[PDB]
Amino acid sequence: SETSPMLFDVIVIGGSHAGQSAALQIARARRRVLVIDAGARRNRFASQSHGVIGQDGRSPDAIAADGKAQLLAYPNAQWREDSVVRAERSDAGYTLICASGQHYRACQLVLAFGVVDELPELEGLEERWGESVFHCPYCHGYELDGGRIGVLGSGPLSYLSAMLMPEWGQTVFLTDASFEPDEEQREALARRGVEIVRDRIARIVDRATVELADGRRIAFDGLFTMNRMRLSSPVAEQLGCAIEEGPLGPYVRTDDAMETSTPGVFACGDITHRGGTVALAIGNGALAGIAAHRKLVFG
Amino acid sequence: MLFDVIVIGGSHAGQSAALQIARARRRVLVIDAGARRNRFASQSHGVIGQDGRSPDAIAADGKAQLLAYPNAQWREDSVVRAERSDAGYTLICASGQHYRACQLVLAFGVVDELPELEGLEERWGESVFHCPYCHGYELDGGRIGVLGSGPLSYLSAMLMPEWGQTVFLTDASFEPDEEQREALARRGVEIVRDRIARIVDRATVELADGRRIAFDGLFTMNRMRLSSPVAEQLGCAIEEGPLGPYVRTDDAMETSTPGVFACGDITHRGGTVALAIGNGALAGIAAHRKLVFG
Numbered sequence: 001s002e003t004s005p006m007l008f009d010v011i012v013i014g015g016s017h018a019g020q021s022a023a024l025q026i027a028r029a030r031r032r033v034l035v036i037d038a039g040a041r042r043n044r045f046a047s048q049s050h051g052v053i054g055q056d057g058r059s060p061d062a063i064a065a066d067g068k069a070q071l072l073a074y075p076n077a078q079w080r081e082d083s084v085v086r087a088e089r090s091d092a093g094y095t096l097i098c099a100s101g102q103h104y105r106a107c108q109l110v111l112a113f114g115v116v117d118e119l120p121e122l123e124g125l126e127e128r129w130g131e132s133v134f135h136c137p138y139c140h141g142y143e144l145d146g147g148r149i150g151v152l153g154s155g156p157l158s159y160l161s162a163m164l165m166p167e168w169g170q171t172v173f174l175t176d177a178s179f180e181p182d183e184e185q186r187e188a189l190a191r192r193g194v195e196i197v198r199d200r201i202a203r204i205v206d207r208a209t210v211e212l213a214d215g216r217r218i219a220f221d222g223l224f225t226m227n228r229m230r231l232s233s234p235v236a237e238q239l240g241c242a243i244e245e246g247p248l249g250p251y252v253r254t255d256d257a258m259e260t261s262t263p264g265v266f267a268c269g270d271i272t273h274r275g276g277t278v279a280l281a282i283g284n285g286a287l288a289g290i291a292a293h294r295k296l297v298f299g
Numbered sequence: 300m301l302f303d304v305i306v307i308g309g310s311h312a313g314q315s316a317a318l319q320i321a322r323a324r325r326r327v328l329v330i331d332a333g334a335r336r337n338r339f340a341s342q343s344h345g346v347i348g349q350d351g352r353s354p355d356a357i358a359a360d361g362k363a364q365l366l367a368y369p370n371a372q373w374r375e376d377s378v379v380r381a382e383r384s385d386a387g388y389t390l391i392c393a394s395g396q397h398y399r400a401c402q403l404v405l406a407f408g409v410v411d412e413l414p415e416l417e418g419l420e421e422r423w424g425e426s427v428f429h430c431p432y433c434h435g436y437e438l439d440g441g442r443i444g445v446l447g448s449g450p451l452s453y454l455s456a457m458l459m460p461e462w463g464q465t466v467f468l469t470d471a472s473f474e475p476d477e478e479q480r481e482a483l484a485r486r487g488v489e490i491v492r493d494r495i496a497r498i499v500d501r502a503t504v505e506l507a508d509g510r511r512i513a514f515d516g517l518f519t520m521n522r523m524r525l526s527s528p529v530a531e532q533l534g535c536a537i538e539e540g541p542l543g544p545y546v547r548t549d550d551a552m553e554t555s556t557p558g559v560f561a562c563g564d565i566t567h568r569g570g571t572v573a574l575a576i577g578n579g580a581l582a583g584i585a586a587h588r589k590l591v592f593g
């Protein structure tokens with residue numbers, strides 16, 4: 001029928017750790033901020049979050065909900081559960097078109113839409129993601145309690161992961177024909193106490209048992225993969241933001257002020273070069289939010 | 300007593316760093332003197348998840364979560380001297396106690412240095428502040444005084460109308476040049492040039508001639524010093540910023556002295572709790588990585 005027009009100083013696309021941290025700075029600067037969030041955090045798979053001082057061991061859902069409530073306590077902050085499908089530069093800033101068909105208008109944008117894990121094509125793996133199969137050992141290595149750990153090989157980068165893993169438990173480097181250690185490497189692994197298993201993996205079964213092509217089964221307490229990741233949205237590219245290749249996938253380029261190559265568009269969290277954890281998302285999200293405010297004031 | 304890492308300073312940056320080292324199953328000791336920079340305010344703001352909580356409760360929660368790891372240790376004390384051995388680092392505390400570590404994380408914070416202005420210091424963290432993102436909102440769009448003190452003061456005053464009607468106070472101690480005069484007027488920032496005798500009531504400025512201007516809050520772009528000379532003792536390169544020195548770090552938060560890392564307000568990109576937690580975590584991970592890969 002009818003509705004009143006709205007205009008936001010900043011719209012934050014993505015409302016998990018990075019976006020909430022950014023939006024909070026803007027809310028505290030008494031500007032109008034909207035978070036549009038599609039409700040699918042990268043960390044929606046594990047039961048606990050670790051490594052963020054003050055939130056260590058808490059449920060990711062509870063951390064997200066507390067942050068949302070704290071932000072929405074500010075009357076100048078608003079939230080929409082929706083997905084931005086198209087971002088357009090306008091004379092008056094930016095227009096966002098969402099999957100619902102709703103449109104929103106902003107002077108500036110903060111991108112905080114996260115990455116999506118692209119898991120190896122291995123039967124049983126995806127079903128155990130965040131339960132017995134993980135990406136980052138600082139996040140989940142401690143809780144393995146010195147047990148048996150499998151490093152699912154995925155190329156050269158898995159070598160360093162294998163070398164690091166004995167900090168947390170008895171490590172087996174399952175190369176899965178993705179990598180063959182040279183002389184130096186084979187010797188460094190042996191010295192580190194890492195066992196190398198070269199046979200192809202057929203599937204993961206039960207909680208965390210690796211079934212090899214030759215029929216062998218090896219039970220693990222946890223498995224790690226250095227998997228690829230992709231940007232969760234084409235919005236950065238739509239806005240003309242420069243995107244660069246990192247070791248494990250693309251990131252949105254940002255400067256010291258978390259600003260992308262497109263003036264007035266900032267980025268934070270996992271989609272930036274130095275993200276990858278909640279602590280970093282909170283930190284650089286705060287930087288992006290303050291930077292976005294400062295541009296509203298000083299251009 | 301030998302540790303893999305000793306963290307000097309056990310507030311937000313130190314706890315964040317120590318937590319990564321603890322989670323990496325290494326032996327980490329936090330030595331902390333117990334005087335946080337934010338001990339003066341009743342609430343913290345700006346940290347998602349901790350917004351509006353008392354800084355004391357935030358720090359206590361962090362200490363509890365860190366000490367849940369039996370490989371983390373805590374000592375309330377002050378490190379007075381740090382020495383490099385080839386066998387690591389040796390620390391001497393005010394208590395006389397010695398400690399040894401393969402690596403160090405400096406997280407001892409900075410100390411604010413306020414102008415000698417009668418009434419100002421006792422209102423610090425209550426109605427006199429440094430950071431408007433931290434404490435501007437609660438002034439509820441009322442009147443704000445910015446205490447002038449050099450180039451950064453002008454920029455602060457230019458930003459402050461976001462939070463309320465702003466007055467730039469020179470305290471009769473310098474005149475803005477006409478460039479700065481011009482843009483301030485072009486923001487609705489009044490310049491008051493009178494000598495200030497004292498601060499009274501909440502944040503009321505009382506002039507030498509007795510007249511009063513009632514503000515809801517005052518801001519200062521004050522200088523800061525490093526809390527401790529330990530960074531200098533260890534040969535860590537230190538840079539002067541506009542408002543005070545900071546310990547130089549690279550991308551992994553490592554100082555110029557290998558095996559010594561730094562985080563929090565003592566580094567160039569600190570100044571808030573969100574940043575202390577973020578770069579603390581980096582420093583802790585980096586310290587661990589160096590333990591493993593050298």
Ligand SMILES: Cc1cc2nc3c(=O)[nH]c(=O)nc-3n(C[C@H](O)[C@H](O)[C@H](O)COP(=O)(O)OP(=O)(O)OC[C@H]3O[C@@H](n4cnc5c(N)ncnc54)[C@H](O)[C@@H]3O)c2cc1C
Pocket residue numbers: 013014015016017018019036037038039040041042043045046048049050051052082083084085112113114115117129130134135139140232233235268269270271275276277278279281
């Ligand atoms: C299994 C697992 C366990 C982990 N455990 C930990 C841990 O214990 N500790 C830790 O520090 N890190 C952990 N991580 C890392 C972690 O999850 C990230 O670093 C963190 O979530 C990133 O924050 P973010 O705000 O950048 O992105 P995200 O948390 O992924 O959130 C992005 C948000 O943007 C929304 N989005 C995407 N597209 C759109 C769109 N077009 N419009 C609107 N919204 C959109 C999403 O739905 C989502 O809600 C873990 C990761 C995984 C995979």
Ligand SMILES: Cc1cc2nc3c(=O)[nH]c(=O)nc-3n(C[C@H](O)[C@H](O)[C@H](O)COP(=O)(O)OP(=O)(O)OC[C@H]3O[C@@H](n4cnc5c(N)ncnc54)[C@H](O)[C@@H]3O)c2cc1C
Pocket residue numbers: 307308309310311312313330331332333334335336337339340342343344345346376377378379406407408409411423424428429430433434526527529562563564565569570571572573575
């Ligand atoms: C009044 C005020 C209000 C603020 N409000 C906010 C806010 O709302 N939100 C926000 O994000 N930031 C706020 N800040 C900023 C804030 O306090 C810092 O960003 C934060 O405290 C820095 O953390 P830190 O761990 O680096 O250092 P600190 O918190 O200063 O802690 C350093 C610790 O190291 C210890 N130390 C010093 N020397 C030694 C030694 N020789 N041996 C052992 N230990 C030592 C100290 O005693 C201290 O406990 C505020 C600051 C002030 C002044």
Ligand SMILES: [Cl-]
Pocket residue numbers: 134135136137139140
């Ligand atoms: Cl993970």
Ligand SMILES: [Cl-]
Pocket residue numbers: 428429430431433434
């Ligand atoms: Cl402050």
Ligand SMILES: [Mg+2]
Pocket residue numbers: 049050051052053055056057058278
């Ligand atoms: Mg956590």
